[PDB]
Ligand binder design. Structure first.
Ligand SMILES: CCCCCCCCCCCCCCCC(=O)OC[C@H](COP(=O)(O)OC[C@@H](O)CO)OC(=O)CCCCCCCCCCCCCCC
Ligand SMILES: O=P(O)(O)O[C@H]1[C@H](OP(=O)(O)O)[C@@H](OP(=O)(O)O)[C@H](OP(=O)(O)O)[C@@H](OP(=O)(O)O)[C@H]1OP(=O)(O)O
Lengths: 241, 137, 43, 82, 154, 167, 286, 770, 76
C-alpha cells in the first residue's frame, strides 16, 4: 500500500507538466525555458499599461512644461493626529487638473451612452432587421435553450471521453481528477471566439455564461434538428447498397 | 496620433494590428472618440487683425461648476444618467485488496480522491509507527 | 574578438546518468552503464 | 602549491590588515565624538517586505503592514525548537 | 479516519506552505539581484572598465529574469493560476446553494442580513446536510450545482 | 432524523451525478408520457433588443472582409470563395447547409448552418428564387431519371437532399 | 495486456487520406486517368526532368549563410544559429545566460541563532580523510581555477580597446527560432534612472556629527541603520516646472519634534556665531 | 414538474439595452496595472455618492469644493503600520519667528468643508513642506541653520568621475534609515501624478500568463473552462485581437509550413515539411529532406501531440512532444523494409504481405524525458528502492519522524498568518544555512600585541561565498557545472596537478587585484556613520564582518585604552537551561534519554540524500530549484490511449495541408517530370466526370466510379463528417435508450437536487431568523 | 559562415567540412583568393553519397529502371 501511494504521488508529480510550472534551472539541452520565455513575450498582448500610454502620446512642449509646482491650500473658515506628514491640499479647488480629468471622463461616458441611443440608430435597425430576416425562422433560440445546448455539448464530450483507453490506466482516477480525462485541450468543448480584442469589448458584451442572463458573443451556433434525422446524412445513396 | 497613419485601409486577408486595435480604428465610439478634435470650435478673424479683436473680445456659478452639467443634460439626454429611476470510504478493488484485513469504517468522509489517499497514508504511517514502537519495546 | 564557447551536451548527459544511478542506490552498475553510453556515441 | 599556500596568503593578510586599519580609523572618527543588540531593531528591507507579502496573500483577509524585528524571529525559532 | 475528518489533510497544508515559501523567496532573490546590479553599475560608472558594464548588461538579461520566474505571479510557482473570483457577479443567477437562499430570504425580509446571522444560517444549512455539499472549487459536486442553477424560470 | 439522512444521500448523489462512467437508475427510464417523435415548434414573433442589434452589427463588422473555404465529399478544401462565389455555388446546387466551411473567425471546420452569420449573407431573395428554380426544374428531374435508369440506387434507401435544397 | 478490444476498433475517427486529384497520362495503362499520385517531397523543387536529360537546380535551395546573405533574409528564415549571433552582445547573452541559482542571502541574513595559531602536526598520528571531504576540498580549487579562467583581471583591464572578454555562462543551445529577437522588443529603463548617480558623504564635518549625536541621544544609544536602495520616484524636474530658491538653501517648514524641560533639541549651526525643451528618448515605450 | 428543456419557443423577446449598466459601470480587479482605470474608479465612486443622495447618478449644481476633499481623504484609505504621538514639544521657537507651523463639524477636513469652509487660502512653496515631511520622517536634522545639507554632500557634483547632480527629494528617499518604507517615502515627497510620477519596475511589470497546454487550471466559471485562458497566449484564448490565419509558408531553405498561425508565428495545428535545415524547434541533425511533422504547434514549437514521419529512414513516432523534443509517452515504428520494397517496383499489397510481420513485431512503446529514452538507469524501480531504504532505518528515527509529521500539521492548523510567515522565514533561513553558514565569531581576532587582525583559514578565504559561481552556477550537491569550452566529456580524465596549482595561485592574485580595485573605487563612501560601514563592504554583503569587527575592537585592550583616553577629555546557557526546563517539565530524566540512546545505538544500530520520495509533489521545504531528471514511466494502457488521441489530433491537423491557392500548393504539387499540375480545387468546376465529389444535391445526381477502395474512403469521410455534425445538432425530444436521453435525465435530476437543497437551506434560514 | 552540414552531420572530417564551407558558404566571389571552379563537384557528390547511402541507392535504381539495366543494378 505504501508503494502504491508513493507511485500515485510520483504520477501526480508527472502530471504537473500539463499546466503552469516554474522553470528555474538552466541546463544544457533543455529548451523548456526558451519556450516559456517565447510564450510570455514574443506575441503582443493588448493592455492599457503605462508603456502603452507613453507610446501613444505624452505632450507637446511648445511653451515648455505644462505642469507647474503645487501650491498648498489652507482652510479659512472652520484630524486623527498623524501630524508626522503634512498632506498635499493643492487639488481641493474645482479649477484644478484632477477635476478637469474627472469632468473629461464624465463627458466621455455621457457622450458614449448618448452615441448608441435608439433614435440615432434607426437605419442600422432597419438594415439589421432586413438582413436577419433572411435566415430560417427555426434558427432563433432562447437564452435557456442556448445554455442547455452548451451543457449538452460538454456533457456529450465527457461521455465520449469515457470511452477512451485511459480508463484502463492504473492511476486513471488521479488523471481524471487532476487533468480531466484528455491530454489535449482541443478535444474538449469550447466556443468559437478567435477574432477581436478582449480588453476592448470587456464593458460592451458578455463572453461567459456566468456574467449574467445575456446572449454570449461567439461565432458558432448550436441548433436543434428541425426534422426527423436521416442517419446517412452525409452518405451518398449509391454507397448505401 | 499624429505620429502614425491612424486609419485602416487594408484589403483581402492582409491586415495587422498591435497597440492599434481593430476597435479603435474601425469600431463604434472608440473610432469616433479618437477623432474628437475635428469638432472643436476655433476663433478666427478673416479681415480684422488678430490681436486687436482678441483684446476687444477679452475686454468683454462659473462655467465648469454648473454649465458643464447643465448643457449636457439639456442637449445629450440619456435615462441612465438623467433619469431619477456507512461505507463512506469508496475504495477501488485494487485499494481494497491491499488492506491487510477487513476493517470497519465509523465516519462519513467528504467525497474525493485526496481524502481517501490521505486516510490510507495516515493508516500506513500509524501501522509503521506501532510496529517500530512494539519492536523497540 | 572571437571568444570560443563549446556545446557541452554529452558531459551533461553523463553527469545526469551518474546522478540517476546514484539516486537508485545502484552505483555498482555505473561503470557498466556509462561505458555503454560512450560506445553509443562512437557508433 | 607552496607558493600558493604561503606567500599569497601573507600578501592577502597584509592587505586585509591595511583595510582593517582604515576601517578602524573611520570608526574612531565617530568614537571620538560619541561622548556617551536590542530586540527592537528592524530587519533588512527584503526580509521586512517578504513577510508582508506572504501575510497579504496567505491570510483570508488582508492585514495591516508590520515592521518585523529580531524578537519575532527569536520567538519563532524558540517555538519551533520547543 | 479521525485525523482526516478533522481537516489535517497533507495537501491542503503543504500547498499553503509552499505558496508562502515562494512568496518570500521571490522578494529575497530580487533584492539581492538589485544590490548586485547596483554594485556593478557603480563600478562601471565611477570606474573605467567596460567589463563591469557588460556584467550589468548580462544581469539585465530578459531570459535570466524569465527563468528566475520573478515576473510570474507566485501562484504559478505552486502550479495553479491567479483567479479573480470577485470580478464575476454575485447575484441570484448562478449563486450557489447557500447564497441563493440567503438572497431570497433577504429579499423576503426586505433587509440585508448581518455577518453573525449569515454565519449562523450557513452553519445550520451545512450541518443539516452533513457537510457533504461542495464548498470549494476542487469539490467534485460544484459542476452539478452549476448546471442545476443554470436555468431561469420563465 | 430521516431528513438529515435524505439530505446526506442527496449530497452523495450530487457528488457522482455527472460521472458518466457510473450507471444511473434514471437512465433509459420510462417517461411520464409515451414517447412520440416531436419537433420543436417554429417561432412566430421575435423582438430583438438593442443588445442583439449591436452584437450583430459588430459581428458583421468583423466578417465583412472574410474569405471562406469549404470541403467536398473527398475531404479536400475547395477554392478561394468570396461572398459572390459562395452565392453562385449555393445557387448551382454544389453546396448546401450541411457543407463544411471555414472562415477567419473560427478554429475548426463547421457545417454552414452552424456558422453564426453565413446563411443570411448568402440568401438574398434572388438567390432563393434561383435556387428554387434550379432545384425544382433541373436537379429533381435529373435525380428521378438517374434513379430510374440505374438499379444501383436502392429504392428503400434513397437520399432526400434534393427535396430540401430550396431551404 | 489482457483487455477486451473486439467491441471497438481502437479508432475514434477514421484515418482518411487527404490528397487532391488531377488528370493526366498514366503511361502504364496508357490511358488518360484522374488520380492523386503526386511527386514525392524528397524530390520536389530539387530537380526537374523536363528535357530528356535531368536538370539540377543550384541557387534555389540555399545550403549556407554568411553575413550579407543573413542580412538579406534576416526576417525570412525559420531559425537562427549561434555562429552568426555570437558577434552581438545581447544575442550571445541570450544564447548563454548566467547560471546564477541557489541564492545566499548574505545581504539580509545577518545575525545567527546561537553562539588560532598554527599547530605543529606530526605525520605519524594522522588518519585518511573520508570520501565526503576530498570532494569538498577539491571544490575550492576548482572554483579558484574557474576564477582564473573566467575573470582574468589582466584581460578585462584592456578589453575594450584591443580585446573582447565578456561574462557569460555555458552555451545552452546552437539554434533558436528566428522570432526570439521579439523578446528584446520591449526594452527596460537605463540604469541611471533606476539608481542614484552620486555617492553619499565621504567625510564627517561638525554639523553632521552634531546631527548624529542628537539622533543617537534620542534613541537611548541604540543607533540607526541606513540602507541604500533604488529610486522610489522619477525625477520631477524632467516633467515639472519647479521654483529655484536662492543658491540651494532650504529652510524646512514643519511642526516641532515631540518628546521639553531641561534638554531641548537644537538645529546644528556650522559657524555657531527661455528656449524650447528638448525631447528625451524614452525606453519604456512600445 | 415543468420540463426545463421543453419550453415552447413561440414568442422570443429579450430586453437588454446595449450600454448595459451591469457590464459598463464596473471596475475589475483584472485591470490593476492600467493607470486610466484609477481615474475611472474615482468617477465610479462619485456616481455611487450621487445615487446615495439624489438617486439619479447625476449631481445637482456640479462638482463642489467638498467633493474633492471627500474623494481625497474619506473615499479610499491605505494601510499604515502604527502611530506613536507624544504630548510635549522638544524644540524652541525663540529663533526667527514663523519657523514652525502651529499645531494646537470641526471633526476633520471633510466635516469642516461641508460646513462652509472656503479652503481658498494659498501660501508657501512645496519644497519647504517636502523637506519638513522628510525631516519628521527621519526624526533627525537634515539641514543646518545656513541651509546646507548635513547628511548628503553639499558641494557641486563633480562632472568628472561620472557623478551627476541629484535633488534632495530623491537622495533622501533612495537612502533612508531602514525604518522608512518606499510608500511612506513617496507619500512624504508629494508624489501624486498617476501618469508621470510613477514607473513600473523591471521585475514587477505585468506579463501574460504561461499555461502550457492549459489542462490543469482552476475554473472561475465551471461551465466554461475556456474563460480562464483569457490572460495567456494559448491558441484557444478568447478574442486574441487578430484572427488566426491559415498560413502557407515556404522558407528559403524550402522548409514548408501549412496550418493555423497567430500573428506570423505557427500556432495551433498544422503540418510542417522539412527541407535543408530544420524548424519547429527540432535539432539540426534530427531531420532530413522530406521528413514531416503533423500535429499541434505552439509559439513555433512542436508542442503537444503529434506524429513525426521520415520517408528517408522509415522511423515513425506517434505521441507527446514538449518544446521541440520528445517528452512523454510515445510509440515508435520502423517501416523501412516496407518503403524499401515499395521503392523497388513492388505493389503495396505484396510489400505489405512480405513485411507486415517483422514491422509488427518490432513496435516499440517508450517514455521519453527531454528527448532521452527512460528505462536503462533503473528509473522504474526508484520509488520502491527508496521505500525500502526508508524502511531500512532504525526504529527510533522512524517513530520520531512519523510523530513529527503529524505534529507539524497539528501545529500549522492553528497558527496565525503572521506566525506562519515567521515560521516560513525561519525555515528558509535554515535551508540557506544548510549550505553557507556564516563564520560568526571567527571573522576578526586580536594578536599577541593586542592588534585586531582578520581570521583567515587554511586558504586565502574570508568567507565560504565565492563570486565566480554567479556566472557558472552550482549543482545540487555543490559542484559548479559546465563552463566555457570545458571539454572533458567525462572528468575521469583530470587536469594535470601542476597546471591546477599554478592556475589556483593566478586566481588568488587576480582576486587580490579585484579587491584592490574595488577598495580604491568604492571604499571612500560612508553608508553607516555609526559603525564606519563603507560602500564596498555594504555592496559585497559583508555587513556582519563590520558588525563583528566593531565589537571585537571595542572589547580589545587597545580599544579600551583608546576609549579611556577619549573619555579623559541567544546565548548557549539560555538554550541549555530552556532545554533542561523542557526535559524536567515532561518527567523525562537524562538517564532515560541515555538509556534510549544506548538501546538505539549499541543494541540496534550496532546490530546491523534525505529520507523521502525523490519524486514528490508536495515537499514542504522545496526551494523550487531541485530538478528531477526522470518521471513516472507510462504503462501500456496509457501509451495506447495517448496514441489513440494522437491519431485523432493528426487527422484533425491534416485538414490544413492543401490550401487551394497557396505557395506550398503552387510550388510543391508536381507530376513525374516536375512540372506543375492543375489540382482539382476549383470552387465551381468539377471536370472529367468527378461531379460526384460535390458536397451538395448536385453530387447525388451523378454516380460513383465503382471502385471499392474509393467507396471505403468516401464512407470513412462521411463517418467523420457525421461525427463532426453530431456535436452541434441535437434532438428536441430524444428517444429513450439513447445517450442524449440519459444526459437530459441527469440534467433534470441535477436541477431537482439543487432545488431540494435550496429549499432545505431556506428552511434552515427561516428557523434561524425567527 | 556555416554550410548547414557542419550543424547536421557530426562525423564530417576537416577536409569535408572545409569543402562544404567553401561550396555553400563564402563563395568564390566572397573570398579574397577565390576563383571559379575551386570546389570540385565530384568530391562533394561523393561526400553527400557517403553521408546518405540509401538515397543514392534509390536514385541508382531509378536510373537503372529508366535505362532498363536492372540486372546490372542487382548484380552490383
Ligand atoms: C427594370 C428591371 C426590373 C424589372 C422587373 C421588376 C422587379 C420589381 C420587383 C422586384 C422585387 C423583388 C424582391 C421582392 C421581395 C419578395 O417579395 O420576394 C418574393 C420572391 C422570393 O420568392 P420565395 O422564394 O419567397 O418564393 C418562391 C416560391 O415560388 C416558392 O414557394 O422574390 C422574387 O420574386 C425575386 C425577384 C427576382 C426577379 C424576378 C424576375 C427576374 C427578371 C429577370 C429579367
Ligand atoms: O611529533 P614528534 O613525536 O615530536 O616527532 C616529530 C616528527 O618526527 P618523528 O615522526 O620521527 O618522531 C617530525 O617528522 P614527521 O613525522 O612529520 O615526518 C619531525 O620533523 P621533520 O618532519 O622535519 O623531520 C620532528 O622533528 P623536528 O621538529 O626537529 O623537525 C619530530 O619532533 P621531535 O624533534 O620533537 O622529536
Amino acid at each position: 500500500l505504501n508503494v502504491y501511494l508513493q507511485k500515485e504521488e510520483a504520477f501526480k508529480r508527472k502530471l504537473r507538466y500539463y499546466g503552469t510550472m516554474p522553470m528555474r534551472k538552466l541546463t544544457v539541452g533543455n529548451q523548456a525555458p526558451y519556450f516559456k520565455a517565447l510564450m510570455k513575450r514574443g506575441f503582443y498582448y493588448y493592455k492599457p499599461t503605462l508603456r502603452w500610454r507613453k507610446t501613444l502620446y505624452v505632450a507637446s512642449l511648445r511653451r515648455g512644461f505644462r505642469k507647474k509646482s503645487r501650491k498648498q491650500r489652507i482652510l479659512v473658515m472652520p484630524d486623527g493626529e498623524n501630524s508626522l506628514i503634512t498632506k498635499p491640499t493643492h487639488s481641493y479647488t474645482v479649477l484644478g487638473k484632477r477635476a478637469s480629468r474627472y469632468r473629461h471622463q464624465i463627458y466621455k461616458d455621457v457622450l458614449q451612452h448618448w452615441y448608441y441611443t435608439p433614435f440615432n440608430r434607426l437605419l442600422m435597425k432597419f438594415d439589421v432587421d432586413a438582413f436577419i430576416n433572411r435566415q430560417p425562422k427555426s434558427h432563433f433560440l432562447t437564452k435557456n435553450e442556448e445554455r442547455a445546448l452548451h451543457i449538452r455539448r460538454f456533457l456529450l464530450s465527457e461521455h465520449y471521453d469515457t470511452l477512451r483507453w485511459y480508463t484502463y490506466m492504473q492511476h486513471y482516477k488521479t488523471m481524471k481528477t487532476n487533468i480531466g480525462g484528455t491530454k489535449s485541450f482541443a478535444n474538449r468543448a469550447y466556443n468559437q471566439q478567435f477574432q477581436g480584442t478582449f480588453k476592448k469589448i470587456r464593458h460592451l458584451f458578455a463572453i461567459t455564461p456566468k456574467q449574467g442572463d445575456f446572449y454570449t458573443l461567439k461565432f458558432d451556433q448550436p441548433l436543434y434538428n428541425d426534422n426527423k434525422l436521416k442517419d446517412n446524412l452525409y452518405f451518398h445513396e449509391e454507397l448505401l447498397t | 496620433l499624429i505620429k502614425y497613419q491612424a486609419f485602416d485601409a487594408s484589403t483581402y486577408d492582409q491586415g495587422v494590428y498591435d497597440f492599434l486595435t481593430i476597435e479603435d480604428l474601425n469600431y463604434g465610439f472608440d473610432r469616433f472618440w479618437l477623432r474628437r478634435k475635428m469638432r472643436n470650435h476655433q476663433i478666427r478673424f478673416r479681415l480684422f487683425p488678430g490681436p486687436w479683436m482678441r483684446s476687444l473680445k477679452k475686454q468683454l456659478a462659473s462655467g465648469p461648476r454648473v454649465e458643464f452639467f447643465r448643457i449636457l443634460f439639456e442637449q445629450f439626454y440619456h435615462p441612465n444618467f438623467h433619469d431619477r429611476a456507512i461505507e463512506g470510504l469508496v475504495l477501488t478493488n485494487t485499494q481494497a485488496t491491499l488492506l491487510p484485513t477487513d476493517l470497519q469504517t465509523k465516519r462519513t468522509i467528504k467525497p474525493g480522491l485526496i481524502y481517501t489517499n490521505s486516510a490510507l497514508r495516515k493508516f500506513v504511517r500509524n501501522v509503521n509507527t506501532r510496529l517500530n514502537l512494539k519492536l523497540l519495546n | 574578438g572571437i571568444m570560443p564557447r563549446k556545446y557541452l551536451i554529452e558531459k551533461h548527459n553523463i553527469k545526469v546518468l551518474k546522478k540517476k544511478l546514484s539516486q537508485a542506490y545502484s552505483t555498482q552498475q555505473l561503470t557498466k552503464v556509462v561505458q555503454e553510453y560512450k560506445n553509443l556515441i562512437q557508433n | 602549491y607552496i607558493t600558493h599556500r604561503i606567500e599569497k596568503r601573507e600578501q592577502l593578510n597584509q592587505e586585509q590588515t591595511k583595510e582593517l586599519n582604515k576601517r578602524l580609523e573611520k570608526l574612531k572618527v565617530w568614537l571620538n565624538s560619541d561622548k556617551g543588540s536590542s530586540p527592537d531593531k528592524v530587519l533588512t528591507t527584503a526580509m521586512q517586505k517578504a513577510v508582508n507579502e506572504s501575510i497579504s496573500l496567505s491570510g483570508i483577509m488582508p492585514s495591516d503592514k508590520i515592521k518585523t524585528t529580531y524578537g519575532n524571529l527569536t520567538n519563532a525559532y524558540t517555538i519551533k525548537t520547543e | 479516519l479521525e485525523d482526516v475528518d478533522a481537516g489535517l489533510v497533507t495537501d491542503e497544508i503543504n500547498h499553503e506552505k509552499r505558496l508562502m515559501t515562494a512568496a518570500q523567496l521571490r522578494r529575497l532573490e530580487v533584492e539581492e539581484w538589485d544590490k548586485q546590479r547596483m554594485k556593478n553599475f557603480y563600478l562601471a560608472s565611477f570606474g573605467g572598465l567596460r567589463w563591469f558594464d557588460q556584467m550589468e548588461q548580462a544581469l539585465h538579461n530578459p531570459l535570466f529574469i524569465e527563468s528566475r520566474g520573478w515576473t510570474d505571479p507566485v501562484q504559478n510557482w505552486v502550479g495553479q493560476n491567479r483567479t479573480y473570483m470577485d470580478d464575476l457577479p454575485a447575484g441570484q443567477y448562478m449563486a450557489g446553494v447557500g447564497n441563493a437562499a440567503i438572497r431570497i430570504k433577504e429579499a423576503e425580509l426586505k433587509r440585508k442580513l448581518t455577518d453573525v446571522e449569515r454565519a449562523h444560517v450557513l452553519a445550520r444549512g451545512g450541518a443539516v446536510a452533513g457537510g457533504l455539499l461542495p464548498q470549494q472549487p476542487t469539490d467534485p459536486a460544484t459542476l452539478a450545482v452549476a448546471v442545476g442553477g443554470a436555468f431561469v424560470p420563465s | 432524523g430521516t431528513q438529515q439522512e435524505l439530505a446526506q444521500m442527496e449530497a452523495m448523489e450530487l457528488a457522482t451525478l455527472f460521472d458518466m462512467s457510473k450507471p444511473h437508475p434514471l437512465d433509459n427510464a420510462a417517461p411520464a408520457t409515451p414517447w412520440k417523435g416531436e419537433l420543436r415548434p417554429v417561432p412566430r414573433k421575435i423582438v430583438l433588443s438593442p443588445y442583439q442589434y449591436e452584437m450583430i452589427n459588430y459581428q458583421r463588422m468583423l466578417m465583412r472582409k472574410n474569405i471562406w473555404y469549404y470541403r467536398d465529399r473527398m475531404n479536400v478544401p475547395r477554392g478561394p470563395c468570396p461572398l459572390h462565389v459562395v452565392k453562385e455555388a449555393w445557387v448551382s446546387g454544389i453546396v448546401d447547409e450541411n457543407t463544411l466551411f471555414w472562415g477567419h473567425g473560427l478554429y475548426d471546420w463547421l457545417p454552414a448552418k452552424n456558422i453564426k452569420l453565413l446563411l443570411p449573407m448568402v440568401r438574398t431573395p434572388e438567390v432563393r428564387f434561383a435556387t428554387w428554380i434550379k432545384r425544382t426544374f433541373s436537379l429533381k428531374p435529373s435525380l428521378n431519371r438517374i434513379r430510374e435508369q440505374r438499379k444501383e440506387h436502392r429504392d428503400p434507401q434513397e437520399a432526400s437532399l434534393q427535396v430540401e435544397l430550396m431551404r | 495486456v489482457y483487455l477486451p478490444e473486439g467491441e471497438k476498433s481502437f479508432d475514434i475517427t477514421s484515418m482518411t487520406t487527404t490528397l487532391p486529384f488531377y488528370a493526366g497520362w498514366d503511361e502504364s495503362l496508357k490511358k488518360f486517368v484522374v488520380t492523386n499520385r503526386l511527386l514525392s517531397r524528397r524530390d520536389a523543387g530539387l530537380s526537374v526532368n523536363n528535357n530528356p536529360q535531368e536538370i539540377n537546380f543550384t541557387n534555389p535551395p540555399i545550403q549556407g549563410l554568411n553575413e550579407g546573405s543573413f542580412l538579406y533574409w534576416q526576417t525570412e528564415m525559420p531559425f537562427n544559429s549561434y555562429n552568426i549571433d555570437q558577434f552581438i552582445t545581447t544575442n550571445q547573452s541570450f544564447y548563454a545566460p548566467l547560471g546564477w541559482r541557489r541564492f545566499e542571502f548574505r545581504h539580509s541574513i545577518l545575525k545567527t541563532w546561537v553562539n588560532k595559531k598554527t599547530l605543529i602536526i606530526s605525520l605519524k598520528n594522522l588518519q585518511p580523510l573520508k570520501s565526503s571531504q576530498q570532494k569538498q576540498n577539491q571544490i575550492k580549487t576548482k572554483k579558484l581555477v574557474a576564477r582564473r579562467i573566467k575573470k582574468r583581471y589582466k584581460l578585462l583591464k584592456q578589453m575594450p580597446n584591443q580585446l573582447m572578454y565578456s561574462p557569460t555562462g555555458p552555451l545552452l543551445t546552437e539554434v533558436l527560432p528566428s522570432h526570439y529577437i521579439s523578446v528584446f522588443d520591449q526594452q527596460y529603463r537605463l540604469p541611471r534612472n533606476r539608481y542614484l548617480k552620486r555617492n553619499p558623504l565621504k567625510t564627517l564635518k561638525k554639523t553632521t556629527l552634531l546631527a548624529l549625536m542628537d539622533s543617537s541621544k534620542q534613541t537611548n544609544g541604540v543607533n540607526k541603520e541606513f540602507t541604500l536602495r533604488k529610486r522610489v520616484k522619477p525625477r520631477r524636474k524632467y516633467h515639472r516646472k519647479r521654483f529655484i530658491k536662492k543658491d540651494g538653501l532650504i529652510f524646512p517648514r514643519r511642526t516641532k519634534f515631540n518628546t521639553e524641560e531641561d534638554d531641548l533639541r537644537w538645529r546644528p549651526s556650522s559657524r555657531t556665531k527661455l528656449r524650447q525643451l528638448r525631447r528625451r528618448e524614452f525606453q519604456q515605450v512600445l | 414538474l415543468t420540463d426545463p428543456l421543453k419550453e415552447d419557443p413561440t414568442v422570443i423577446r429579450d430586453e437588454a439595452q446595449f450600454p448595459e449598466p451591469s457590464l459598463y459601470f464596473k471596475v475589475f480587479e483584472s485591470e490593476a496595472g492600467e493607470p486610466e482605470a484609477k481615474i475611472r474608479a474615482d468617477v465610479n465612486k462619485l456616481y455611487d455618492r450621487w445615487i446615495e443622495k439624489y438617486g439619479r447618478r447625476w449631481p445637482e449644481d456640479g462638482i463642489n469644493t467638498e467633493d474633492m476633499v471627500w474623494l481625497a481623504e474619506e473615499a479610499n484609505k491605505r494601510k499604515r503600520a502604527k502611530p506613536r504621538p507624544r504630548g510635549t514639544v522638544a524644540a524652541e521657537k525663540t529663533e526667527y519667528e514663523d519657523e514652525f507651523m502651529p499645531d494646537p463639524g470641526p471633526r476633520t477636513n471633510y466635516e469642516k468643508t461641508v460646513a462652509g469652509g472656503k479652503w481658498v487660502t494659498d501660501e508657501f512653496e512645496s519644497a519647504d513642506y517636502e523637506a519638513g515631511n522628510l525631516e519628521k520622517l527621519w526624526d533627525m536634522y537634515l539641514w543646518d541653520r545656513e541651509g546646507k545639507p548635513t547628511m548628503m554632500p553639499d558641494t557641486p557634483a563633480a562632472q568628472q568621475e561620472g557623478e551627476e547632480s541629484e535633488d534632495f527629494d530623491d537622495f533622501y528617499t533612495a537612502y533612508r534609515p531602514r525604518d522608512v518604507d518606499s510608500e511612506e517615502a513617496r507619500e512624504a515627497v508629494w508624489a501624486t501624478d498617476e501618469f508621470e510620477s510613477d514607473e513600473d519596475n523591471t521585475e514587477s511589470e505585468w506579463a501574460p500568463e504561461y499555461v502550457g497546454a492549459g489542462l490543469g487550471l482552476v475554473a472561475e466559471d465551471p461551465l466554461n473552462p475556456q474563460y480562464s485562458l483569457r490572460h495567456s497566449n494559448h491558441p484557444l484564448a478568447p478574442f486574441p485581437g487578430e484572427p488566426l490565419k491559415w498560413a502557407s509558408y515556404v522558407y528559403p531553405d524550402f522548409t514548408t509550413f501549412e496550418g493555423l498561425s497567430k500573428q506570423s508565428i505557427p500556432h495551433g495545428m498544422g503540418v510542417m515539411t522539412f527541407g535543408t535545415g530544420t524548424g519547429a524547434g527540432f535539432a539540426m541533425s534530427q531531420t532530413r529532406y522530406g521528413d514531416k511533422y503533423e500535429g499541434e504547434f505552439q509559439a513555433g514549437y512542436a508542442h503537444g501531440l503529434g506524429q513525426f514521419t521520415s520517408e528517408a529512414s522509415g522511423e515513425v513516432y506517434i505521441g507527446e512532444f514538449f518544446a521541440g523534443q520528445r517528452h512523454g509517452c510515445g510509440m515508435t515504428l520502423d517501416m523501412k523494409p516496407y518503403f524499401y520494397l515499395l521503392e523497388r517496383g513492388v505493389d503495396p499489397v505484396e510489400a505489405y504481405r512480405r513485411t507486415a510481420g517483422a514491422i509488427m513485431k518490432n513496435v516499440e512503446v517508450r517514455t521519453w524525458y527531454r528527448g532521452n529514452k527512460l528505462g536503462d538507469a533503473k528509473e522504474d524501480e526508484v520509488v520502491e528502492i527508496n521505500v525500502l531504504k526508508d524502511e531500512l532505518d532504525d526504529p527510533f528515527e522512524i517513530a520520531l519522524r512519523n510523530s513529527l509529521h503529524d505534529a507539524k500539521l497539528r501545529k500549522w492548523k492553528a497558527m496565525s498568518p503572521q506566525d506562519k510567515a515567521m515560521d516560513r522565514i525561519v525555515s528558509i533561513i535554515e535551508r540557506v544555512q544548510r549550505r553557507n553558514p556564516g563564520r560568526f565569531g571567527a571573522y576578526y581576532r586580536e594578536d599577541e600585541k593586542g592588534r585586531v587582525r582578520p581570521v583567515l583559514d587554511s586558504d586565502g578565504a574570508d568567507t565560504d561565498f565565492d563570486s565566480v559561481d554567479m556566472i557558472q552556477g552550482v549543482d545540487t550537491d555543490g559542484d559548479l557545472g559546465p563552463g566555457w569550452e570545458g571539454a572533458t566529456d567525462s572528468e575521469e580524465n583530470p587536469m594535470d596537478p601542476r597546471i591546477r596549482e599554478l592556475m589556483a595561485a593566478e586566481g588568488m592574485d587576480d582576486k587580490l587585484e579585484d579587491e584592490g580595485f574595488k577598495d580604491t573605487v568604492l571604499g571612500s563612501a560612508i553608508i553607516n556613520p555609526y559603525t564606519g560601514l563603507d560602500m564596498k563592504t555594504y555592496l559585497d554583503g559583508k555587513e556582519r564582518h563590520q558588525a563583528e569587527l566593531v565589537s571585537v575592537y571595542k572589547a580589545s585592550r587597545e580599544g579600551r585604552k583608546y576609549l579611556n583616553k577619549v573619555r579623559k577629555d541567544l546565548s548557549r546557557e539560555a538554550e541549555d537551561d530552556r532545554l533542561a526546563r523542557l526535559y524536567e517539565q515532561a518527567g523525562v530524566s537524562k538517564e532515560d534519554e541515555r538509556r534510549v540512546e544506548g538501546l538505539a545505538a549499541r543494541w540496534r544500530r550496532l546490530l546491523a540524500r534525505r529520507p523521502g520520495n525523490p519524486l514528490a509533489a508536495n515537499d514542504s521545504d522545496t526551494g523550487f530549484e531541485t530538478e528531477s531528471d526522470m518521471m513516472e514511466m507510462c504503462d501500456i494502457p496509457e501509451i495506447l490511449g495517448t496514441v489513440q488521441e494522437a491519431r485523432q489530433i493528426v487527422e484533425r491537423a491534416r485538414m490544413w495541408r492543401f490550401k487551394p491557392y497557396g505557395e506550398v500548393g503552387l510550388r510543391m504539387a508536381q507530376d513525374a517530370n516536375g512540372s506543375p499540375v492543375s489540382l482539382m480545387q476549383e470552387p465551381l468546376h468539377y471536370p472529367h466526370g468527378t461531379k460526384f465529389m460535390a458536397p451538395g444535391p448536385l453530387g447525388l445526381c451523378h454516380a460513383v466510379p465503382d471502385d471499392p477502395s474509393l467507396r471505403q474512403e468516401m464512407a470513412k469521410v462521411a463517418h467523420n463528417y457525421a461525427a463532426i455534425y453530431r456535436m452541434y445538432n441535437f434532438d428536441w425530444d430524444p428517444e429513450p435508450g439513447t445517450v442524449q436521453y440519459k444526459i437530459d435525465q441527469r440534467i433534470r435530476r441535477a436541477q431537482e437536487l439543487r432545488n431540494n437543497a435550496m429549499a432545505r437551506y431556506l428552511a434552515a434560514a427561516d428557523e434561524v431568523l425567527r | 559562415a556555416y554550410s548547414f552540414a557542419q550543424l547536421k552531420y557530426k562525423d564530417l572530417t576537416h577536409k569535408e567540412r572545409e569543402l562544404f564551407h567553401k561550396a555553400y558558404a563564402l563563395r568564390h566571389f566572397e573570398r579574397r583568393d577565390g576563383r571559379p571552379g575551386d570546389v570540385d563537384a565530384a568530391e562533394l557528390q561523393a561526400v553527400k553519397d557517403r553521408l546518405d547511402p540509401l538515397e543514392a541507392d534509390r536514385r541508382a535504381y531509378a536510373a537503372a529502371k529508366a535505362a532498363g539495366r536492372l540486372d546490372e543494378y542487382w548484380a552490383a
